[PDB]
Amino acid sequence: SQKLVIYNWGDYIDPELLTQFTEETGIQVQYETFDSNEAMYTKIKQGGTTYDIAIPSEYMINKMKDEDLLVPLDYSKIEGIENIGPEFLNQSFDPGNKFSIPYFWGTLGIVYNETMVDEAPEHWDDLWKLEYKNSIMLFDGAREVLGLGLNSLGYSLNSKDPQQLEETVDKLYKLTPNIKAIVADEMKGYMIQNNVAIGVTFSGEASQMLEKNENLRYVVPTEASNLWFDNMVIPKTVKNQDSAYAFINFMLKPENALQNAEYVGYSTPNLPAKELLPEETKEDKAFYPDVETMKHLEVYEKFDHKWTGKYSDLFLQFKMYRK
Template identity: 35%
Template structure:
C-alpha cells in the first residue's frame, strides 16, 4: 500500500515537471535580465509592466534579476545564460561593445526612441547610439540621518570623520568605494596610475576602522532603521529609503561625484531579436515609462514623462539637480584587466585592515591538536613495540 502510494507520488512529481513542457502552446519567449526592483512590478497598486507586455503582445517574458554589473558580465562571458534584453550600466556596455558581445539595434523596430531626450543621446559609452537605449540615469551622493549628523555634510570628508565611527557605511562594490576616496583626493576615477590607486587605497584603509559595514542592498534596512548615520549611495535608492524614514537627507558632496546611466541592450546570441526590440520599444511607451519612473524612482531620459504634469517626481531636485547645485561629475569607464586585478587585491587589503580581532582560539586548538597527534603517535609506536 505504502509502496503504491510512493510510486504514485513520484509519478505525480514527474508529471508536474513534464507537463508544462508538453502542453504549453508554441509561444515566443524572451529572457530579460534587469537590476532588482528596477521595473514597475504591480506592487502597491502600480502597473505590472511585464504582465502588461505579455497581455498586449502575447510574447512570454522570462524576467530575472542581476545584482552587479560584474555578475552579469560573468554570466554573459561564460555563456551560462542566453538573454535577449539586458539593462547594464555605462562602463559595462562599453566593455561589451569592445568585446563584440552586443547586437546593433534596428531602430525601425523601436520608433519610441524619439522620446529620448537629447542630453541622453550619444553618450560616451555608445557614441553612435547603435547598441543601447537609455533606461534611467542617476548620481551618487551622501545619504545622512538628520537626527545623527549635524551640521549637514558638504564633503566626502564626512565619511572620514571619527565623530561618526561605527556609524558609517561604505559601498561593498570596490569600484564605487574607491570612487568616494578618489573624489576626495581629486583623482580621475578612471586612472591607470598605480600610485593613484595606492593613494586611494591608503585613504580607504584609514577609513576602515570607522566603517560599520561594507554594504549593498542591506543599506535599505540599515538606513531606514536608523542604524547608521552616513552612507554613500545612489540618488534613486535614497528616495525609496526616504519614503520609509523621513529623517534621511541627501547631499551632493562638493568635490564631485559619479554620473551613471543604465541602458537597454541586446546581447549577441539572442534568438528573438525582433521580440527583444519590441520589448525595448514597449518600455518607452509613455504610459509604461511613466509607471516605471514612478516606481523605480530614478531619473528618466524620457521626454514625454519629463513634461507630464502627473509625474510626481518631475521637480525633484535630487533626481534632476539644477546645474548650480550639482558638482562636477565623472563617469566610470572600463579599466584594463591588470588594473582591475590590482584593485581587487588592494580592496582585500582594505577589508583586512578592519582588524578582525585576535583569533586566540585557533592557536589553542592547533596546539591541542598537535599535542594530541603526538601523544597518539607515541602510543601507537609503544603498542606496536609490544
C-alpha cells in the same frame, strides 16, 4: 504566436506595463529575472537560452559588447530616441549608443539620517568630520571607495596616476575613525533600522531605503561622483527581433517611461516623462540633480588587468589598516 523573451533584474518593471504591451501589440511576454551581474552574464554567454531583450548594467555592456554578445541596434526601427536626454547618451561604455538605450540611471552618493546628524553632509570631504566618529558605512567596492577618495582630492575616479592613488589611500586612512563598517547590500538594514547615521551607496539602493524610513535623505556630491546606467540591449541569441524593437519603442513612449519610474522609483532618462512626474519627485535634487552636478559625474572606465589589480590591491591596503 508573436512573443518576446525579456531578461531583467527582479522587481525592476511595473508589471502592468507588460500587460499593456501585450494588449496593445499582441506580443506575449515570457519574463525571466536575474539578480546579479554575474548570473546574467553566465546565462547570456552560455548561448543556449533565447533572450530578445536584456537589461544589463553599464559594466556588463562593456563586457558583452567586447565578446560580441550584443546585436548592434537598428535605429531605423526605433521610435522616440529623441526622448532620452543627451546627458544619458554617447557614454564611455557604449559610444554612439551602438548597442544600448538607457532604461534607468543614477549616481553614487551619501544616504544619511537627518535626525542623527547636525548639518547635512553635502560633499565627500564632509565624511571626514570629527562628529561622524563610528557613524559611517561604506559600500564594499574598490572603485566606489577609491573613487570617492580620489574625488575628495579633486582627482578623477578613473585616475591612473600612481601618485594620485597614493594620496587617495593616505586620505582614506584618515577616514577610519568614522567608519563603522564596509558592507554592500546589507547596508540597507542598518540604515532602515536607525542603527547608523550615514551610508555611502548608490541611488537606487538609496531610493529603496528612503521608502522604508522617512528620516533618511540622499545627496549627490556636486563636485564629482559616479554615474551608472541599466540599459536595454538585444542579445545575439534573439529569436524575436520585431518584438524586441516593439518593446524598446513601447518603453521609449513617455507615458510608459513615466509609469515605470513611478513604480520602481528610480530616475528616468526620458526627459518628456520627467516633466510629467509629481512636483516633489521631479524637483528632488537627490535623484534629479542639477546640470553642474551632472556635468561632474563620471562613469567607471573599464580598466585592463593591471589597473583592475592596482585598484584591488589598494583597497585591500585600506582594509588592512582598518584592522
